[PDB]
Design a protein around this ligand. Structure first.
Ligand SMILES: O[C@@H]1[C@@H](O)[C@@H](O)OC[C@H]1O
Ligand SMILES: [K+]
Length: 919
């Protein structure tokens, strides 16, 4: 037993048990490293930042154990096999590794020897787990689920996990990583017996057609057109590339399992895909052809009995599909919490003791960095398009929002503003963008900010490619094989290597000269998975992104966006004193410290996709990234929407309206997508209920800005989140652990988006222990019940927790439009409450030096008294003296939810404590 200033190392006595080392990072944060070699040498962590905490501890030796005790945690290490167990300050057990539960296996790749590592933990049936990124299965609770971390367009990896048992876990590994089954999805015949449509064993029956005309039939032992390399087996006779011809494939047969229990499956698919098991529809999905993804299901199956399978695929060239399977784990490990990683040097993780879900997130921010404050205008409405094709189109959109007096802060310029053959030059095509400097000035003159797309992608004919390539920072393989992108005739292209500080310097310098010099406000840092060529198999994605400056893409598969965004953050911040804003398609552990917001990628205009974002956003927040958004309405659309078929116009309008209501209540409020156009008046004309609704929520957002921005300030000040899972504030209510279509927008607003076409109401579960006020009526509902909440097309169910204090302002066409606006404090009565209102200049980094104010608001229910406490702090432009209106909502009120509601009292405030009585 070896003692150190910050922990101990134990070499266990059992043969094969790896040495283990514990380090105290803080009283409630313990690092655990296990390494067969006993050296604990690893590649320098990319996610970690330094922590200066209380590293005091005391050691005791029992018979089979060494125990480390801080003020918050007791960690016990077995001297026999090294397995670690955690208990809290009162000795109550919290988390224990499985004894003998470590695995290390050699992986010899790219000239190195790595270990694939696996750690198993004991996990009770009633433990709930959240986080591990942002995913697309619609699962809120992750307990018992298999989740693979592999950066993809719509699937985001962040290796931080939070548990209902009052802890969090940071898994410091940058390779492909698996929660649950460490083996990943198997080909169909691996642990299943197949029978075709005529009962013959060994395969299913595959039938291929073109435009409803059968081409051929054959037996197939797998359903696998998953990646580009798999497409070479598609029957050449059955392929049509005609502009408006479609293809169809069916698979039909039976399956039988070899081991009984819970079997999980994934139908990976693009375009239209259905799957029937025993004649019951199990998957019914559409995605755009170039972005397939996993659609998982599960079945309880036992050997000896057959079950029918029928797959129906309706596609265009090219599309992708695969039916994959996992058989049950052995009983001894099937219930464990298991973390696996493809490539590393050792097992290395951090245990975070958390009295609340909030404290769990705070430990992630301690370990990987505080969440940089974003500009205040970033929390207003964003309008985007794929794509504005000229500067007249982009400027025209801002001007039309101004003409209609709709609220708009930010406008976005998508890809392809450059000359076609010059991706990566950051030049503008003069045909469509003849005066980029004048474009930016025209937007600024209308009191709006403009963000521009910048990829990690370069064409080999550009000066910028050759500068990066000559310095060694261009990945070479995609150009060596001559892979052509999708633009016009097709262009060779590659992506740069961001891991070296020298590469980041070149990348930013090019952007600074060409774009930052013209006044652009924000950077849309797209495709940083990186998406070198969509739908390559994983071996090719790795081979076309390796070697990097630190090692292989196998060791660093998920970490690309972290150094990529870091370089732009550092460069932009050194260029002037304004706060940076970045929208990155991928986040990762630590990306919040580089002023990076993220979004869920190229999801589709489908009701299922909309509902899936609710649980995606909650788990994103609990993974530790607080600034998150999506494309309102979805990104890619079916032909019935693209062609604007009048028969589907009502559903198109209802979907985008429901999704717009939802987007107004997520951290960043943003409209984007492919044709049709997505601006409010282009969704539906004025006079329709869709326009009325979108206009209402567009303006309501601006009135709620004091509330929203106060939460933004506390993402930094209190290491907090904005989008809150219902279990964060109601951790003792079991009914909120698994609900996947409700959440809290800050502490006050319970949000229940409507995700069914033609619904005029929906079930909403109200958490127990508080009463709730319907935002649109003031009707009071007691907690702990499900209700049929009214939801006409124009309004989304929204409820306010009793005791909520919500600072609001007047409707604004843009941030700070009305100077010295009055503040309206709205109290939703029914219980005690408090809200410390955060304010600052919203523009620079003065908050880092304490340039911010906090005004305490305290509501006492018994006395009916709102106490406005003494102001603390000051900043450039603060209102020393200001008008504060107060509004009390204690039940049904005629103007409930009005954009400009009646106020019940008004005082002048100068920073000294003042009291307002309801009476
Ligand atoms: O949001 C889109 C992004 O995900 C990618 O596909 O490039 C174009 C953008 O419009
Ligand atoms: K700056």
């Amino acid at each position: 037993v070896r003692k150190a200033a910050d922990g101990v190392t134990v070499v266990p006595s059992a043969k094969g048990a790896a040495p283990v080392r514990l380090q105290v990072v803080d009283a409630g944060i313990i690092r655990v490293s296990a390494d067969p070699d006993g050296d604990f040498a690893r590649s320098p962590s990319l996610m970690r930042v330094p922590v200066q905490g209380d590293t005091a501890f005391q050691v005791a030796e029992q018979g089979d154990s060494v125990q480390l005790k801080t003020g918050k945690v007791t960690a016990s290490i077995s001297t026999v096999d090294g397995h670690v167990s955690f208990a809290d300050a009162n000795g109550k057990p919290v988390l224990s590794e499985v004894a003998g539960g470590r695995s290390f296996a050699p992986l010899n790749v790219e000239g190195k020897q790595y270990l694939s590592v696996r750690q198993r933990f004991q996990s009770p049936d009633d433990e709930a787990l959240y986080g591990f990124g942002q995913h697309q299965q619609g699962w809120m609770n992750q307990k018992g689920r298999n989740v693979e971390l592999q950066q993809n367009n719509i699937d985001m990896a962040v290796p931080y996990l939070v548990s209902s048992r009052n802890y969090g876990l940071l898994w410091d590994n940058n390779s492909i990583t698996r929660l649950g089954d460490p083996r990943g999805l198997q080909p169909l015949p691996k642990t299943l017996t197949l029978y075709d449509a005529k009962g013959k064993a060994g395969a299913l029956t595959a039938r291929y057609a073109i435009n409803g005309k059968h081409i051929l039939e054959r037996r197939e032992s797998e359903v696998n057109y998953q990646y580009l390399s798999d497409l070479t087996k598609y029957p050449k006779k059955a392929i049509t590339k005609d502009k408006n011809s479609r293809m169809q494939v069916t698979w039909e047969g039976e399956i039988e399992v070899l081991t009984g229990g819970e079997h999980t499956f994934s139908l990976y698919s693009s375009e239209y895909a259905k799957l029937y098991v025993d004649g019951k529809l199990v998957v019914d999905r559409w995605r755009q052809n170039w972005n397939p993804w996993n659609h998982e299901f599960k079945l309880d199956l036992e050997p000896g009995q057959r079950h029918t399978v029928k797959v129906e695929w309706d596609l265009i060239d090219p599309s992708y599909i695969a039916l994959l399977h996992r058989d049950p784990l052995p009983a001894a490990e099937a219930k464990d919490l298991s973390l696996w990683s493809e490539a590393g040097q050792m097992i290395d993780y951090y245990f975070v003791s958390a009295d609340s879900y909030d404290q769990a997130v705070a430990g992630y921010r301690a370990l990987t960095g505080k969440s940089t404050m974003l500009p205040k205008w970033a929390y207003g409405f964003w309008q985007s398009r794929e794509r504005y094709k000229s500067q007249d189109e982009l400027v025209g959109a801002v001007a039309e929002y101004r003409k209609r007096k709709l609220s708009l802060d930010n406008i976005v310029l998508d890809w392809s503003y450059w000359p076609e053959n010059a991706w990566g030059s950051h030049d503008f095509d003069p045909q469509h963008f003849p005066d980029p400097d004048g474009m930016v000035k025209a937007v600024h003159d209308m009191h709006a900010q403009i963000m521009i797309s910048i990829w990690p992608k370069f064409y080999p004919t550009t000066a910028n490619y050759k500068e990066l390539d000559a310095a060694g920072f261009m990945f070479k393989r995609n150009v060596e094989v001559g892979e052509l992108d999708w633009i016009g005739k097709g262009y060779k292209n590659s992506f740069y290597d961001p891991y070296s500080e020298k590469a980041q310097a070149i990348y930013w310098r090019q952007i600074n000269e060409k774009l930052n010099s013209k006044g652009f406000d924000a950077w849309w840092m797209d495709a940083d998975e990186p998406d070198v060529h969509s739908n390559l198999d994983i071996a090719e994605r790795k081979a076309r992104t390796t070697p990097n400056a630190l090692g292989s893409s196998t060791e660093y598969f998920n970490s690309y966006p972290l150094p990529h965004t870091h370089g732009v953050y550092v460069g932009d911040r050194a260029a002037d004193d304004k706060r940076v804003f970045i929208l990155s398609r991928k986040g990762y552990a630590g990306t919040q410290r580089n002023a990076v917001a993220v979004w869920s990628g190229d999801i589709v205009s489908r009701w299922d996709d909309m509902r899936d974002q609710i649980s995606g956003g909650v788990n994103m927040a609990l993974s530790g990234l607080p600034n998150w958004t999506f494309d309102i309405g979805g990104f890619a659309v079916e032909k019935r929407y693209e062609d604007q078929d009048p028969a589907h116009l009502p559903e198109w309008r209802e979907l985008n309206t429901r999704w717009f209501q939802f987007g107004a209540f997520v951290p960043i409020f943003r409209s984007h997508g492919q044709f049709p156009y997505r601006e409010i008046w282009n969704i539906a004309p004025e006079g329709t209920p869709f326009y009325e609704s979108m206009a209402y929520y567009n303006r309501l957002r601006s009135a709620l800005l004091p509330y929203i921005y106060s939460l933004a300030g506390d993402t930094y000040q209190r290491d907090g989140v904005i989008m809150r899972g219902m279990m964060m504030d109601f951790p003792n209510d079991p009914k909120v652990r698994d609900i996947n279509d409700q959440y809290l927008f800050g502490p006050a607003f319970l949000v229940a988006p409507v995700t069914r076409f033609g619904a005029t109401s929906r079930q909403v579960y109200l958490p127990a222990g508080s009463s709730w006020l319907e935002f649109a009526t003031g009707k009071r509902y007691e907690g702990g019940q499900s209700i049929e909440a009214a939801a006409p097309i124009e309004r989304m169910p929204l409820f306010v927790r009793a005791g909520s204090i919500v600072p609001t302002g007047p409707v604004q066409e843009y941030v700070d439009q009305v100077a010295d606006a009055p503040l309206t404090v709205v109290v939703y009565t029914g219980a005690d409450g408090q809200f410390s209102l955060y304010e600052d200049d919203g523009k620079g980094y003065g908050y880092e030096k304490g340039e911010f104010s906090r005004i305490p608001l305290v509501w006492n229910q018994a006395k009916g008294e709102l106490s406005i406490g003494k102001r603390e702090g000051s900043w450039t432009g603060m209102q020393a003296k200001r008008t504060i209106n107060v509004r009390f909502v204690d039940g049904p009120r005629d103007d409930a939810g009005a954009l400009a509601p009646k106020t019940d009292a008004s005082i002048q405030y100068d920073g000294k404590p003042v009291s307002v009585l309801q009476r």
